[PDB]
Scaffold this active site. Structure first.
Site: not given
Ligand SMILES: C[C@H](O)CC(=O)SCCNC(=O)CCNC(=O)[C@H](O)C(C)(C)COP(=O)(O)OP(=O)(O)OC[C@H]1O[C@@H](n2cnc3c(N)ncnc32)[C@H](O)[C@@H]1OP(=O)(O)O
Lengths: 291, 293
Positions: B197, B147, B159, B126
């Site tokens: 995020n 992700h 993702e 991340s």
């Protein structure tokens, strides 16, 4: 205490009408003010329709009581094209008119002379600071923000905005009123965006910017926030929903107020849509096309 | 085309565990890798508990059916302490270990020698550029980001990050793999925060600041976003759910890349809590105190 029982709502827009409707629905005597009888006629009719759609669902087993309940709520809503005469004895004045400071200050400055003594004033404004309006009067301790969300009749949240001058008794009165409306009041200071818009709008702008950078598609960005963060609507679906012009206006308001903060920088894509009258669902087209 | 069937997940953490779980529950042969046998046993225990939870729910009326559901899935998750000992025969490697650049590259540089030619490498990182980690191998055409989101067993999103070197073939495969997991994959450039995020974390920071600034309380800010924005969790509950330390680290990284950017300015409150080892639910206390489970 100052138990709000008689309420004056100025503004026949969806917001003003919604506020009137809930207040009427919870036992408050309401007076809805606007510029023409035609407007008032339409707004009240709007309330009538909204009230029936719900009664046909809740009172399906006994339609008589349903029509009764609907009739009782409508009759507790009065209309007038002259605020001055109405506010002479009202307990609360909730304003929800055009988002323009000058116009708003005239109204209240005027109402501050006719309104009773105990009368509390409150704006439902989204793009202005309560304090800037309260100073157009000398009733500042009885002036506050009472911010609702559309569809007013459904949304349980209400932001009771308190300014540094706002009285404590005023605050408590609006908190009890909000609950009396069957709403859930949260507190916040007279800061731009308060709580909800302050955290929600910039995020939306951020999502637009991420798209303009070419980093991802609007569709994927929407799928992303719904499936990844569990949000009801992706940022673009939501923008079209709340209105692109509505959003632009608010941001420009903060932008002009703080020209440096990068979070309020205009979005070329947003501006374009607004310019070519593509406001969202309320025009059948925003970032996406509708119906 | 080469369909992913064998998957090697590195990291017995909550993320890795979840990835292994969903992969195994969807018919993939899985190997979960971490440092010791006890760690692996602990990780696989959490998976089992999460599975019997899903089973006694989908088969609330048939315990036997629920047991088989759990058994089958659980028996397709093998454990090893050295990924280099399994990657020679795996189709995909999903890494979810310490968010440390040196440690990640060291890992991939080594696995890049034992892994079969077709094997694809993916990181669930991340706070790092997929491109950074990829250039630690000679398999960049087979390296990408994959992700996931906590809770992995529940959140449908995945993702799929493509670096300038990720081949289309490698992309499509991770896309099909995502769908095979029962997830919905979305594409994104290899930029910090990717999509979720990048929009969620800054928002979460803004909420902390509005609070620190004294404008509104944590309680009301959470109520406001749940009722006014319809979110499943107010910003403070979420922070405590994803981990305060976990958040701080990602932000420090972004701040570190652009100290001038306001969006990443550190937060005294967040830092103070992390310095007190109050990381959120993990530790029974973050912005809120949680009754120990
Ligand atoms: C930091 C990084 O890099 C990436 C990230 O992770 S960013 C953050 C992403 N995550 C989010 O945004 C969290 C947002 N929150 C959510 O979407 C929801 O609150 C949630 C999915 C946690 C569930 O919320 P909630 O409605 O309260 O459910 P909860 O009370 O926990 O449990 C009920 C349901 O959730 C499920 N559930 C939740 N956690 C579970 C788990 N770990 N395992 C199995 N089931 C679980 C249950 O099976 C159950 O289904 P049911 O309603 O049919 O009975």
């Amino acid at each position: 205490k100052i138990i709000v029982k008689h309420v004056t709502v100025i503004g026949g827009g969806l917001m003003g009408a919604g506020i009137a409707q809930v207040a009427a629905a919870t036992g408050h005597t309401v007076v809805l003010v606007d510029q023409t009888e035609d407007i008032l006629a339409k707004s009240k009719k709007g309330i009538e329709e909204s009230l029936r759609k719900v009664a046909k669902k809740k009172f399906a087993e006994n339609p008589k009581a349903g029509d009764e309940c609907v009739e009782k709520t409508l009759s507790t809503i009065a209309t007038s094209t002259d605020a001055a005469s109405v506010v002479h004895s009202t307990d609360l004045v909730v304003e929800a008119i055009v988002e323009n400071l000058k116009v708003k200050n005239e109204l209240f400055k005027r109402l501050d002379k006719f309104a009773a003594e105990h009368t509390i004033f409150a704006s439902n404004t989204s793009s202005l600071q309560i304090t800037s309006i309260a100073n157009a009067t000398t009733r500042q301790d009885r002036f506050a923000g009472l911010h609702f969300f559309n569809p007013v009749p459904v949304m349980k949240l209400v932001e009771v905005i308190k300014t540094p001058m706002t009285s404590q008794k005023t605050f408590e009165s609006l908190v009890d009123f909000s609950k009396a409306l069957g709403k859930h009041p949260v507190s916040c200071k007279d800061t731009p965006g308060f709580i909800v818009n302050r955290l929600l709008v910039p995020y939306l702008m951020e999502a637009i910017r991420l798209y303009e950078r070419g980093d991802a598609s609007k569709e994927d960005i929407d799928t992303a926030m719904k499936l990844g963060a569990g949000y009801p609507m992706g940022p673009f679906e939501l923008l079209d929903y709340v209105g692109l012009d509505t959003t632009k206006f608010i941001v420009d308001g903060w932008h002009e107020m703080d020209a440096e903060n990068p979070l309020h920088q205009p979005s070329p894509s947003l501006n374009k849509l607004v310019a070519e009258n593509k406001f969202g669902k309320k025009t059948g087209e925003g970032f996406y096309k509708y119906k």
